[PDB]
Amino acid sequence: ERPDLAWLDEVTMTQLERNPYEVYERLRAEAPLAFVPVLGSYVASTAEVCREVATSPDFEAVITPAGGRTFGHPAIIGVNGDIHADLRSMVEPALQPAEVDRWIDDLVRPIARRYLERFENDGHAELVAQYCEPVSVRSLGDLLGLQEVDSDKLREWFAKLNRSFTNAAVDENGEFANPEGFAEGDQAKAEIRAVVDPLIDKWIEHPDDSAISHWLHDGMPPGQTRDREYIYPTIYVYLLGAMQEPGHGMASTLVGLFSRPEQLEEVVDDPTLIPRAIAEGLRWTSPIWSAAARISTKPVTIAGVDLPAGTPVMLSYGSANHDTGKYEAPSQYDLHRPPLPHLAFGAGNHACAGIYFANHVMRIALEELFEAIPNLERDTREGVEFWGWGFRGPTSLHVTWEV
Template sequence: MTTSTTWIDQITMAELDRDPNPIYERLRREAPVAFVPAVGMHVVATRELCLQITQDSDTWSTVIAPSGGRTFGAGTVLASNGDRHRELREWIDPQLRPSAVDTYVEKLVRPQAQAILAKIEGLGAADIQAAYFAPVSVRAVADLMGLVDVPSDTLVRWFQTLAMSYGNAEVDALGNFVNAAPFEAGDKVKDEIIATVDPMLDHWTANPDHTLISHWLHDGMSDGEVRDRAEIYPNIYVFLLGALQEPGHVMTTTLAGLLQNPDQLEKVVDEPSLLPRAITEGARWVAPIWSAAVKVANHDVTIAGLELAAGTPVMLAYGSANRDESVWENPSAFDVDRPAMPHLAFGSGNHACAGTYLGTAIVRIALEELFETIPNIEPDPERAPQFWGWTFRGPQALHVLWEV
């Protein structure tokens, strides 16, 4: 007796990493909640259902994707619920709230952006992601965390390795991971991070300062006590991966969208006040965290006509939700002028990204400085950007030209 397979059973991780959009367009139309064997869980593809799940904490609890749990270990804010989640956010959130960010973000980002641009503006050509966007993103967030003395290339290597580990989601028919190597590489990087950061924690224990990690160590603790490092390290890994990498991805994606639409690029360069709209559209167009949020059913539930047993995990595909045809007209197009509609690039509900305001401020300042310094930026016609990634998605590079 043979078992019939469907097109969903034949989806591969290679296809999802290369371009998930055709697959998710079909899922939204035919199977908005579907078990995808390649990733070992049900995937939710529409905006309405993603919102429904994120806003119903009685029915759904937050967990972390199996590959994420293997990468970060236990105790991350990503996998916490209820009182534990509130406790973690109480020491993670304060320095990331808009009122706090506005006190430091200009000094944190603009001088770095100006210094990097001063080194490249005479070149006339660059992979602007590698030469400018990634360094600005990495340096701004790392310095805020307190990792001032860690070289940028080391930080990039750390988050790239962690990203490959987190994105190593492919499983076999028994639900076992197919590839061990990305996890092993991630383990080596975590050992390196601990060896680097432990002496800093020793220093901050006796000499607290304004950096994020110092706040995490001390805030909410009784006098003379500090938070256990076992609580801090998993969340350092989360920040090294998400916070360092994703502003750079949004910068690159936003510029890529503008370069595909020269009239929109000209409008934004001439009117910098339009940058927030462009950034919002860039994050919607290609969500930097495409598929990472996982919820688990607290009890038996029926969703989109599908009965799921208690304990069933579902992956919320925010990148798919952001291209839902029932919400956005021609969603695959980048359009600065489209009507404003909240997207899900930074999540929703009580697990929405704590660093959204900081991240978008970093992106805005970096693009302001770029367009001020190189207003005549153009795409390299010989080297079109190649987007890649299912868990984290963005251009692999963005080659541009300008007259010097």
């Protein structure tokens, strides 16, 4: 429909998943808000357009079509009004900074040590599967009340929900081009129900200090609980992004540091620099790269485009965090970049609710790793591939150390 962008017709889902950067570099220059045919949606590629859409009074929350097919209703990321207010009040207590500070160290640090103890003397490791992912899911899983769900299973669930949620390709008629791509999402949800339904049964009659027990009971009249069908979509929100992204953030940070060996040494020498390294890592490869969206509630003009009411816009925060109007050489990792606002946690009233928790999980994990293996080296016999358009991170991170 937009003639000068006819090249967008030839962009593929696989290309966006393998490497979205060239297409989005072109988008940021030619059309900060652009309809991408294979995604079937407008996409916002620049920091200005992403932040405007995420905070605009003329936009409200929505899930991308494949995300809605995966999570259903009411997922906290895609609802508004009183429902959203209730779901926010539901998840917020255990994420409050003063509360996190009470227990985050006794939570994450023994978990990090346990996973490190399995390989820290091996001299070689694949840190995504052996460390970054297990620490992320074990920390959150224990907080939720899923202590007895093995980290292998939690990692499998977030991988299947990832692929279902991002099964976004549409054909010439706007229909999903890969309809069998949702089946492993459906299978993951079926497995989650068989595991979590008996836990919910128990928590209803015998509440405890797990987060999910508090989702059932907090703020309810005496003897009442939130119906499980009302909270499961937000459980799924957690079992995808909240489980996956701290691991993505850690690993992308390590990859960025390895690309600046002078800066990796600095951080290992002075671990007070770990929060700064993580912040740049999230800017450099944003874990929730283009999974979020908003929908317009009235006619609105964005980046010169007159959008009718009811128009979805995908928020490609990962591209926004490479906006060359904001950063110098944003494709390069630079620990010493001046700290600026970034959009890796989103913006607006649907901005990330778990920032403080997530940053601590990533910080403690990297502190323990560098203490256990100060001579960590990237295994340059293998290259690092990143995968994902909706959610993005390294598929593996092979490392060595002397020893």
